[PDB]
C-alpha cells in the first residue's frame, strides 16, 4: 500500500483542514479546530510538518499576554510529536482594514501597518524553524481600472519587498521569501497574477536572490494555464522554493480541492516532473476539505491528499523506468531536444548548406513525432493497464 | 471627426487585411491581395507603416530570382507612399516541417533550419528600415505531457535567442527583438504563454537589453488575464518594445477582432494606459477582418481599428483632464499611492509605534475606498455622458 | 440627464445594498443596513421596488411574534414610499443545513424542510403583491461525481416544483416561478447550470406555464456565454418572466458588478433585445457594491445600476431610429432573415432548381455580409460619436 | 487484455482518422486516405461502423456521374467488411457559402440550398441504414451583435428542422434527428451553444419525437461545464441519441484529443453513466489525431480512443460492484437521495410538524455527507490502486 511518513516532506497549513467551511453564500458547517490538536492528528496521519499564517495561530488583536499563551501551547505539540514548520505566512487579507490590499494599498498608513505586522511573523516563523516565508497578496488588486495604477502599485509592491529583504539581511535571518501568484479571487484582477509574473517582478527587486515562487496547482489553473509547464519555467529558473498542491475543476472560484482531485492528468505530469527534478522541499497541500463534510470526512481528505501523491509517484516512477517508453520517447526524439542546435557556433551555422540551402523541408516534415503511441503508453501507466 | 494621419503611429500586417479568411472548418472567401495593392490602400487610409512576416511578402520556396522581384514590387510602392516598415516577423508556424516547432522542434535539423530561416529575414528586415523584429513561437509547445520537456525546450529557445542576439550585434544591426506571448492555439499549451512568462525568460538571456515583449490584447485575454495590467507590469520594466491591437469577446479561440471590439472597457484602459505612460512605438493592428466580409468589408474593419483607437483617446484624455475626475483620484487616494511607505527607512518604521502599537484598524478600515464614484465618472467619460 | 423615476420599473433586493462584505477571504467591511431604511433610500433615488429572500427580512430561526415584529416595520416603509414588491424568493443556501442543497439534498428530511420554508415565504410574498416567486439553486449540485446521481437529483427537482405548481394552485394564487442557472459557485457544478438547461427542464414539469426563467448577466458569462444570445431564445420561448442585472469581467467567481461594469457591449446589446422585445418586466439589479466602498459608495453604485441602463436605453434607441443604420441593416440582409426560407411549401423547394440544381454557389458565396461597417455604427453609437 | 470489437459499437467518422491536419495556422500534414481504405483500416481495428459528411465522400460539385463512382467505391468497402454506417450528416460549414451560416444564413438562397443539400444526403444515408442524422450548425451564429437577430434566427432554424420533420415523415423513413451542440468556434458565438439549450429549442419543434442531441465531450467542456452532468439531463429527457467522445483540456479551441485525454475523471464518470443507464446506441468518436501525427499515428490514436473506453468501462463497472463502495454510497444517502420528498402528499407535507415546526436545522447541519471517502474510493478505482 502507499503509507506516508515524515520522510514524504508531506505539510499541511492549519488553516486548512481548520477551514470551518464559510464561503461566500454560507456559514460554517464545522467547528473550530485547536492548531495544537491539528498537529498532533497530522503526525498521527504521517505529515512532515505544519505552516500557518499569524492570524491562524494567534487571534487578530490579542495581547502580548494571550499570544505568548497560544504559542506556548503550539510549541508544546511540535516538541512531543517532533513535528516541522518549514513554512509560515502573514494573513493580509482577511481584517477590513486589508480591503484595498496590504503592501499595495492606496492608503499609506495601511501599507505601513502591513509591512509592521510581517516583519513580527517573521520574527516568530524563524524561531520556529521555518525556512521560507509566504507572500500571497490576495488583496493586491482592483476591481476597476482607475483604482489603482499598476505602474505605481508595483514600485510600493517593489518597496515592501526590499524592506523585507533588508531586514532579513539586517538580522541574518536564515530565511527566504516565496510569492504566490493568483489570478483573481478577492479582487477581480490580482497583481503577478501567474508564475510568469511574479518570476519578472522578483527580478526587478534589490536581492533577487532571497526571493522564489509558491505556485498553486488551482491557482495556474484559474488562467487556464499549463501548471506542470510553469512549474519547469520556475524550475529551469532556480526560483521553485516551495509549492502548493491541491485541485482545480476548471476556471472557475478557487476550489482548493484534495490533491489529485481536479486535472488528474496534470497531478500525474506535475508528480512525473517534481520527482525527476528532484526538487526537496516541502509537498505542502493547500486545499480545503468541502463544507460538505463532518471532521472524519476532514481528515479523509487530508489523508486523500497525500495518498494520491504516492500512487502517481509510483505510476510516474514505472512509467519512466519501462523499456517501451525509453524505445517511445526516442522515437519521439526526446533525446535530440537535448542536443544543443548550434554546438559548432554561429558561423559554422551560417557556412552550413544543409542547414539551408540544401534542407529539404518536404522530407523533414514527413516524418512523424509519434507523440499519440507516448502518450498513450503514459495513460496506461497512469491507469495501471500496465506497469 | 477623429481621421487618421501618419504621424498616428498606426501599422498593419500584411497578413491581417490580407488574410483570405480560411479557417479550421473553412476554406477562403477572399482571394489574395498583392502585398503592393495593400500598401497603396493602406497609405490612403491613413496607416503610417506595414509589416510582414517573410512568407507573406516572399513564397515559401521561392527562388533567388522570384524572391528580388518581389521585393522589389514591395519596395516600389512603400517608396510611392512613404510608408514605414517599422517591425517585420518570421513564420515558422506555417509550414508542415514545423510542425513541432520552430527553435524547439525535438528535431535538431528542423531547428537549425528554422534559426537559418529567421537570419535570412532579419537582413531584409533591416534593408527596409524596421527597429523591431517579433518572434511568435506558435508551434512552440505540446498537446500531451511526455512530448515535450519543457526545462530542455526552454534551454533550446534560449540557445535560440542567444544565437540571434550574436548575430545582430555582430552584424552591427539597430534592431530589437520582442516576443509575442499566446496561451494556446495552435498547440495545447505554448510555451512563454503570457506577458510575465515572457519578461521572466528574457532575464536570463545572454543580453536581455535586446529583448522585450510585444503583447497582443487578445493573447491575454485568451487566459483571462486584465491586458492594461500586464502591460503596466511589461512598461515598468521597460520592456514594452511593440505591441498589437485587436479584440477579444472572451477565452476561446483566438478571434483576432478589429480593435474597440471585443473587451471595450479594457480598450478604454489600455489607451489611457499608453498615451498616459508616453509609449512611442506603432500602434500595431494584428486583427482580421471576419471572413463573412467582402474586400469593401476589409478596408472599412480596418479604417474602424484607427477610428476606435482615435475615439477612445479622446476619452481618456477628457477623463484625465476632468477637474472633477482629479478630485475624485484624491477622494480614492490615487495621489497616496505614489508616496513611499517608508521613505524614512527601515529603521524609522521599524520604531514607528504609529505603524503598529498605536494604529487602529478598525478606524481605517471604516475609510471607503470612493471607487464606485470613480469607476462611474470614468463610464460617463466613456460614453461621452460628459466629457 | 438621465434620471431615474419608477417608471423606469427599477428594483434592487434587499441583500444588494446590504451586501455587508463578506467574502471567502474576508470579514464584513459594512455594518448592517435595516430593511426600512433601504427601502427610503431606494425610493429616493428613484427605483420602483424591493425584492427580499425571506433570511433578508426576517432572521433565521426568529419566532412568529419576532417575525410578525420585522413584517410590520418593512410593511410601514413600503406603505410610506409607496415602493412595490415585484419580486420574494427563499434562501436555501446560507444555513449548514443545506450544505448539500435544499430540493436536491441526499437527505430526505432536508428535502421537506425546504419545501416548507419556500411555502412560507410564498405566502408572504403573495401578501406583499409579488408576481414572480425566483428559485436560485445555489446548492443543487456537487464537488465530486459520485456524491450527486444527476438523473435522480432531477427527479427531486421536478418533484419539488411540481409540489410549488400543485400548492399556488390549489391557493389560486397569481404567482409565477423563475428558475435562475448559474454554473458553479458555492457549488463545483451546480445543477441547470444555464438559460438552455432550466428552458429543457421546465418543459417537463407537470404545469410548466406556471415557470419561467431568471437569468442573470454574470451567470451566463461566468460559462462564457453569449447573454443576450440567451435573452433571446428565452424570449423566443416566451420565458423571460423576470431578469437579474449586473456586471460580469469574464470567467471567474460571480462578482456582481453594478450594470454597465464588465462587458460593456454586451449590456448594450442586452438593452437594445429588452427594449425592442417590449419587455415589460422589472429591471431587477442584483449586484454587490464592492467591499471596499462605505455606505455613500454603496448608494453611488446603486445609483450607477441605473444611470448605465437609462444612457444605454438612449443610445440603443438612437442605433436603431439612424437611417444610416436602417440602410446597413439592410445591406446586411437583415430584412431578408425575417422573409420564410420555404414559405412555397416543402413540395415547391423540392421541385426549384434555382435552389439547387441551377444554384452558383461561387456567385452567391461573392456576396459580403457588411457586417463591419454595421457593427461600427453600432460602435459610434454607443461611443457617442453619432448620435 | 481491452481488445474491441464490433460488438463494443466503436464508430468513427471520415473525417476523424481522415483529417489532414490542417489548423487556422498551418497546411496539411499528412495526404488524404480514400474513404474505402479508412474503412478497411478501422475493420481491422475492431470498429463497429463509420459516419460521414456528405463532403468527405463526394467532392463538392462533383457530376451524378463522379457521385455514384464515389459511393460505389464506398458501398464495396462497407459489404466486403460488414462495417454499418449507424449516422450521417451534412456539410454545412465549408464551402465560403456557408459563411453566415447554412439553415440560418440572413441570405434567403443560401438557407434554400442548404435545405435542398441536406436532403440529398438524407436519401443517401436512409439507403446506408444509418438510423440517426447530425446536425452541427458550426456557421449558425455571429460575431457582432446587429448582424444576426436571434429571434428570428432561431425562426428560421425552427423552420428549417419542421421542413426536416416533414420530409422524413412523408418519405417514411424510419431515422432521426440529433443536434450537436457547441458554443463558439468557428463563429464568435454559435446558436444552441450548449445541451440545454438545444434540448429546450427541441421541444418548441412540430414534432418533437424525431429530435434529439448529439453532444461532445470537448464541446461543453469549452463552456467549462460538466459533460457527465449535461449527458445525464438529455438521458433524464430521453433525448440522447447519439454521443461524440473525444477529449478536450480546457476552455479553448476545440482540440479533438482523442477520448481518455483532456478531463480524465470526466471521462469515468461519462462511462459510468453510459454504463449504468444503459445506453445503447453507438460509441462515435469525433476527435483528430494531432497533427504533429503521421500515418502509424493516426491509426495509435484511433486504437487509443477504444482502448480508453475499455480500461475506463472496466474500473467503473469494478467500482459499482466494489461492497465497500455501496457501504460508502449508502453513508452518504444516495439511497435516501431516490426516495420521494413527499410520497404522502402536498397535504401531509404541510401538516407534518415534523418538517418544519418540530424540525431541528442544527442537529440535520451535524450530519457529514461523508463525499470525500467516497470519491476517494472513486479514485482508487480509477488509478486500480483497488479493483
Ligand atoms: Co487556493
Ligand atoms: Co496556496
Ligand atoms: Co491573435
Ligand atoms: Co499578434
Ligand atoms: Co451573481
Ligand atoms: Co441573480
Ligand atoms: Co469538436
Ligand atoms: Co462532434
Known sequence: ???????????????????????????????????????????????????????????????????????????QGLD??????????????????????????????????????????????????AQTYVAWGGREGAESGAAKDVRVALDRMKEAFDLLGEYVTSQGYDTPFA???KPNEPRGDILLPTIGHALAFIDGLERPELYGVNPEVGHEQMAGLNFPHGIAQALWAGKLFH?????????????????????????????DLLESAGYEGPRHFDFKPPRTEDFDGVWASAAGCMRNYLILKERAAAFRADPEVQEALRAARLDELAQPTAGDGLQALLPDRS???????????????????????????????RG
Chains 1, 2, 3, 4 share one sequence.
Open 1 to 75: 500500500s502507499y503509507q506516508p511518513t515524515p520522510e514524504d516532506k508531506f505539510t499541511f497549513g492549519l488553516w486548512t483542514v481548520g477551514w470551518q467551511g464559510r464561503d461566500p453564500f454560507g456559514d460554517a458547517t464545522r467547528g473550530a479546530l485547536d492548531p495544537a490538536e491539528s498537529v498532533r492528528r497530522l503526525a498521527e496521519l504521517g505529515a512532515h510538518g505544519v505552516t500557518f499564517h499569524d492570524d491562524d495561530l494567534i487571534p487578530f488583536g490579542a495581547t502580548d499576554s494571550e499570544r505568548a499563551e497560544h504559542i506556548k501551547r503550539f510549541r
Open 80 to 129: 512531543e510529536t517532533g513535528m516541522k514548520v518549514p513554512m509560515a505566512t502573514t494573513n493580509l487579507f482577511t481584517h477590513p482594514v486589508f480591503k484595498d490590499g496590504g503592501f499595495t494599498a492606496n492608503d499609506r498608513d495601511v501599507r505601513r501597518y502591513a509591512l509592521r505586522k510581517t516583519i513580527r511573523n517573521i520574527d516568530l516563523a524563524v524561531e520556529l524553524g
Open 179 to 181: 510569492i504566490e501568484p
Open 243 to 271: 509549492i502548493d498542491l491541491n485541485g482545480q475543476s476548471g476556471i472557475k472560484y478557487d476550489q482548493d480541492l484534495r490533491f489529485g482531485p481536479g486535472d488528474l492528468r496534470a497531478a500525474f505530469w506535475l508528480v
Open 355 to 385: 542547414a539551408f540551402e540544401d534542407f529539404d523541408p518536404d522530407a523533414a516534415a514527413a516524418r512523424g513525432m509519434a507523440f499519440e503511441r507516448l502518450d498513450q503508453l503514459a495513460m496506461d501507466h497512469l491507469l495501471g493497464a
